[PDB]
Amino acid sequence: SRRGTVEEKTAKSDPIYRNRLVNMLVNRILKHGKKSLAYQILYRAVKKIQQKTETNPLSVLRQAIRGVTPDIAVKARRVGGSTHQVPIEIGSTQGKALAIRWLLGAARKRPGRNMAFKLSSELVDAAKGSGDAVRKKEETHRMAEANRAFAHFR
Amino acid sequence: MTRSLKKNPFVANHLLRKIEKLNKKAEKEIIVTWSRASTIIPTMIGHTIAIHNGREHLPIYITDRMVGHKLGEFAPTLNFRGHAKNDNKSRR
Amino acid sequence: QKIRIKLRSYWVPLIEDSCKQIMDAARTTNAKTMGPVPLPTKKRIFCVLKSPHVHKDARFHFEIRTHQRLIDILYPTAQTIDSLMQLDLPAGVDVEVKL
Amino acid sequence: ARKSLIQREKKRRNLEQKYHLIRRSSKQEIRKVTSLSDKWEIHGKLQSPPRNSAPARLHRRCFLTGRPRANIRDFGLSGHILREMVHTCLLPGATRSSW
Amino acid sequence: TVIGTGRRKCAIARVVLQEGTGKFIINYRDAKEYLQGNPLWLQYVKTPLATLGYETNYDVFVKAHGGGLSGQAQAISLGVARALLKVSASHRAPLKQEGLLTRDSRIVERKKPGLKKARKAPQFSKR
Amino acid sequence: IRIGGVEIPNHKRVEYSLQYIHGIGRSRSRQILLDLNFDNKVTKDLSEEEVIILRKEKRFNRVAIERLKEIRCYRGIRHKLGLPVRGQRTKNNCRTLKG
RNA sequence: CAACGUUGAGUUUGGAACCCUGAACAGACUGCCGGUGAUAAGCCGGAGGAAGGUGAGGAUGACGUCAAGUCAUCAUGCCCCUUAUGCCCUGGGCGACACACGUGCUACAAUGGCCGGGACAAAGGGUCGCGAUCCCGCGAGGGUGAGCUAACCCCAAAAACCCGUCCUCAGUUCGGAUUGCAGGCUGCAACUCGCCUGCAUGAAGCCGGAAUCGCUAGUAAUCGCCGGUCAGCAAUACGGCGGUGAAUU
C-alpha cells in the first residue's frame, strides 16, 4: 500500500453517451478479447429497453442496479486458529463492480435466445424483484448481519 | 483400409520369380517368405505362403477374396486377441 | 546503375569502412557513384538445449546477423576496373559482382 | 558417436555418388505418374538394386563426435558441441542474442 | 502543406493537412469506405478535429500501412494531433489536456522461451 | 410423406432433411439440386411431382447399412473384437468403439 | 514517393520531402517544484516531455545446497568382454494392453455454426531447393514451366473481425471421435507405422466431484502465420511473429 501506489486502470469511455463506469460492463461481458461484438450486447440492450420503460437508457440502468448493489459482504480472515467469517463494509468503487458480475452470470445462466434479450430481461427484473440477479443481493445479506458480532461498528 | 497405392503396387522380385517357376504345370504349395511389404498378385491362388513376423513363419492360405492386401496384415505383429496356439502354463 | 556489387559480412564497423573506400576511390576515377545505401538485415533466431539430458528449461539463443549493403557505380570505365579488381582488402567480407 | 556407427553411414554416402549420380535419372522417368495412361510396371517391378542404397537412409551426424540427433543444416554439428564452439570463438557471427 | 507522423504498435500513418472542404481520404479510399461495416473506432480518428473545430475547414490525405484496423485508427489520431501543432503553436494546451500528443508505449512483444504465452508458466503435477 | 425406407423427414428444409437418410451428407444434399433443379426452401411448400423426381435420385436405405458390414475377408481384424484398428492406445482411451 | 507531366498499375520521366531501411547522435539523472518524512534517504503527486522513477521487456542468475542429472554426446580412471556383451544383413520391435497418472488439443455453441461478399500484420524460409502463370482433376495433386540465388521471385489469398442472409438452442444446419469405399504424395519400400484428399457414417460431451494451475497491461484470454527437425510423419510438440484486447489488487 505504501510501496507502489496505483489508483485505478481505465480505458476509453462509453461510445457516444460518455461514461466511464458503464464502460466496465462492456469489459466484464468481454469474451476472449472481442470488444467489437461486446458493443453489440450492451448497445442493443439499450435499443430494446426503450419500449419496456419510459425514460432515458442511462437512468433505467442506474435505477435498476441499485437493487443488485450490495452494502456489506463476507471475507475470510483467520486469527488465533479458527477461521472467522468477518463482514467488512463494501464501498461505492467495489460495490458498483460487484453488481455487474451477478448480472453477467444471471444473463448467461438463462439459455433462452440471444444475449441481447438475456441482458435486457435481467435489467428490468431488478426493478420488480425477479431473476438470479436480484436474488444474490438478498443472499449475501443472509451471510452478513448474521455474523455481525465478528465485526465491530464504525 | 486404403494404403499407399498409385499404379505400381510393389511386389518383390524374389516373390513372383519363385511363384512363376511353380506356375509352369502347377506343383508345390509350401513357400517361405521374409518380405511383408509385397502385394498379392492374382496368380498366388491356392499357394500357402508362410510369412515372417519376427518370431516364426505362419502358414496362411490365399484365396480370390484377398487381392489388394499386403500379407503383413495377415501375420500378427504382437500377441493380442486372435488365432494362436494355447501355451503351456508354468508357475504363477 | 550498370555494375552492381553486394557486400555481405557479420560485424558492422568492418563493412562500413570498406564500402566507404569504394566511394572515395571510385569518384576520383571518372563517373559519379550512388552512396552506401543499406538494405534490411536478415536476422535469424533459433534455440537449442544446453544440458545433454532431461532439462527442457534453460535453453539458449544464437544470433547470426547478416548485415547487407549496396553501392552502385554509374559508368564502367577502364580506370575503375583497374582499381576495384586490385583493391582486394576484405578480411571477412564477400563481394558479389553482378552486371 | 561410435567409430563403428559413423563408418556404417559413411558407406551409405559412398554409393550416393555411384548409384544416385547418373543411374537414378533412369528410374525417375517411370516411377512418377505420367500424363498418359501407359505407365510401365517393368522398371518399378525390377527395382531390386537399391537394397542398402537410399537417399533417405542418410543421417547428417556431428562432424566432431557423430550423434544422429539435433543436427542443424547450417552448422552440421550437434547441440552440445555446437554450443562449445560458440561459447568460445570458433564460428563468425555467433554472438549473444536478445530477441 | 503540413506534415505529421504518428505511430501505434507497428502501424505508421503519414498525415498531410491542407485547407479545403473536409473529406477524409485514407489510402485512395474514403474514411467510411476503408473502415467499412460501421466500426466504432472510426470516431477516434475525428476526435483531434472535434475539440478544436477544424473538420469543416481542413481537408486531409493519409497513407496507412502496417498493424490492424484498430491499430491504424489510433495512428491517424496522433498524426493529426502532431500536425495541428505546426499550423499554430497556441493549439497545444487544449489538445495536450486529453493526451493526444502522447504516444501509447504499450506493445505486444516477444514470447519468452520455456513459457507458452510469454508470461504464462507451464503447470506441474500437484501433491 | 414416405421418401424412401423407414426414415421420414419432417418440418425442416431440404438441405438438411436428406441428411437423416444414409448415403447422403452435406455434400450430396447440394449435388441433388442440380439434376433435381430446386432451391434450399422448406419441405411443406412443394408439389406432388417434386417428391417423385426426388425419389428417383437415390433410395438405398437399410441395404446401405448392409454394405458397411459387407463381407469379412481374411483381415477386418480388431473389428470382430472391438478395438481402434489403427495406432491408438486402447489401454486408457477409445470408448468410441467399446461399450 | 508530397509537388509536377499520368498506358491508373508509381506505371514512366523525375523528385528525396515523408514512410520504411541501415549505421551514428541526442534523451529521465528524482534532475526540477511541492507535500509527507528526523531541515537525510526515500515515498506520494505535479510540471515539462514520445518515454520517467531500476521506462517495457531480454541477456546476464555470487560464495554455495541436493556426493541432484549426464561416463548413450564427447573425453577419461578402473573393471570386464576381446572366432566376444565386436562386426554385417533381413524381418520384427520402441506409436504393444484389463487399468492408473501428467502435460496438451478439439467441443458441449448461437458474444455460435454455415453460405456469399469483403478490410488491415509482423516475423521468417528457400539452389540433391521456394516454386508463381496456364492446362487438367470435386480435391490432395499432377503436366508444362517463368522468375528469385533473393526488402526485385516464390512460400500466403492471415485469421478473428465485418455487411447481408439462414438457423433460431431439439445432442441441434454444435461436435467431430470412429467406421466403410475410392484416391493422391513422399521413398527399395510405408500391413504392423504414415500424412493428406474425396464420399458416407457420425458417438462421447450440454462446462465436469475432492483437489488444483497460470496470469496484474497490452499481461490474461483468444485468433492466424512462420521457422528449426525433415524425403515424408504440414493448427494439435518446441521455438519464433503479429491481430484483437480485459478483470482485480
3-state helix, strand, coil in chain F (%, to 5): 10, 0, 85
Residue identified by cell 441499485 is A66
Provide the sign of the torsion angle of the four alpha carbons F77, F81, F85, F89, taken in this order: negative
Domain spanning B7-84 has what CATH number?
Answer: 3.30.860.10
What Cα–Cα distance (Å) separates residue B58 from each residue in A7, A102, B36, B66, F90?
A: 80, 70, 12, 17, 26
Q: Up-side HSE of residue C48: CA atoms within 13 Å toward CB?
A: 20
Cα A35 from chain centre: 19
Contact E20, E59 (CB under 8 A): yes
Distance (Å, rounded) from C-alpha C85 to C-alpha C3? 13
Length of chain B: 92
What distance in Å separates the CA atoms of residue B28 and residue A146, rounded to the nearest whole number?
A: 97
Sorted by where each starts, the structural domains of chain D and their CATH numbers stand as 1-89 (1.10.287.1480)
Residue type, D87: H
Cα–Cα distance, C40 to C67 (Å, whole number)? 8
How many other CB atoms sit within 10 Å of the CB of residue B27? 7
Q: Which residues contact B38 (CB under 8 A, 6 or more apart)?
A: B10, B11, B12, B15, B70, B71
- DSSP readout, F51-74? THHHHSS----STTTTTTS----S
CA–CA separation, E102 and E85 (whole Å) = 13
Resolution of the experimental model, in Å, one decimal? 9.4
Alpha helix positions (H), chain C: 12-18, 21-24, 78-84
Count of Cβ atoms closer than 10 Å to residue F79 Cβ: 13
Contact C50, C56 (CB under 8 A): no
Neighbours of B73 (CB within 10 A): 16
* Helix A115-128 × helix A35-42 angle, to 10°: 40
D residues 5-44 closer than 8 Å to B (CB): 31, 33, 39, 41, 44
CA distances from A128 to A65, A117, B9 (A): 12, 17, 78
C64 touches chain D (CB under 8 A): yes
The domain that contains A52 carries what CATH number? 1.10.455.10
- The domain total for chain A is 1
- Chain D residues with beta carbon closer than 8 angstroms to that of B11: 45
Helix ranges restricted to H, B1-92: 13-20
- Residue A102, burial from CB neighbour count under 10 angstroms (0-12, 13-18, 19+): buried
CA D9 distance to own-chain centroid: 9
Cα–Cα distances in angstroms (integers) from residue E41 to residues A29, B20, E56, F69, in the given order: 19, 79, 20, 59
CB-hemisphere CA count at 13 Å for A20?
6
β-strand partners of B31: B49
Whose grid coordinates read 486372435? B82
Cell of B33: 517368405
Supply the DSSP symbol for C46: E
C43 vs C65: CA distance, rounded Å: 5
For residue C60, the chain E residue with the least C-alpha distance is: E113
Q: What is the CA radius of gyration of chain B?
A: 15
Q: Hey, which residues does B49 pair with through a beta bridge?
A: B31, B60
Largest CA distance in chain C: 65
DSSP β-ladder status, E58-65 and E24-26: parallel
Q: C42-76 as b/e, with b when 16 or more CB fall inside 10 Å?
A: eeeeeebbeeeeeeeeeebebbbbebebebebeee
**How far, in Å, CA of D16 to CA of D54, rounded?**
8
**E28 burial class (0-12, 13-18, 19+ CB within 10 angstroms)?**
exposed
Residues 34-63 of C with CB under 7 A from strand G: 37-47, 51-54, 58-61
d(CA D23, CA C99): 37
Strand partners, E64: E13
End-to-end CA distance of chain B: 40
> What residue segments make up the domains of chain B, in order of their start?
7-84
Question: Residue E60: helix, strand or coil by DSSP?
Answer: strand
CA of E23 to C1' of G158 (A): 31
CA distance D51 to A22: 75
Question: Residue ranges of the alpha helices (H) in E1-127?
Answer: 31-34, 47-50, 69-83
- Report residues 1-60 of D contacting strand G, contact meaning Cβ closer than 7 Å: 1-2, 4-5, 7-8, 16, 20, 31-35, 44, 47, 50-56, 58-60
- Report the structure determination method: cryo-EM
- Name E residues 45-104 whose Cβ lies under 7 Å from strand G: 61, 63, 65-72, 96, 101-104
Using alpha carbons only, give the angle A6, A8, A13 rounded to the nearest 5 degrees. Answer: 150
Strands, sheet with E29-30, edge to edge from the N-terminal-most edge strand? E7-8, E11-19, E58-65, E24-26, E29-30
Q: Radius of gyration (Cα) for chain F, nearest Å?
A: 19
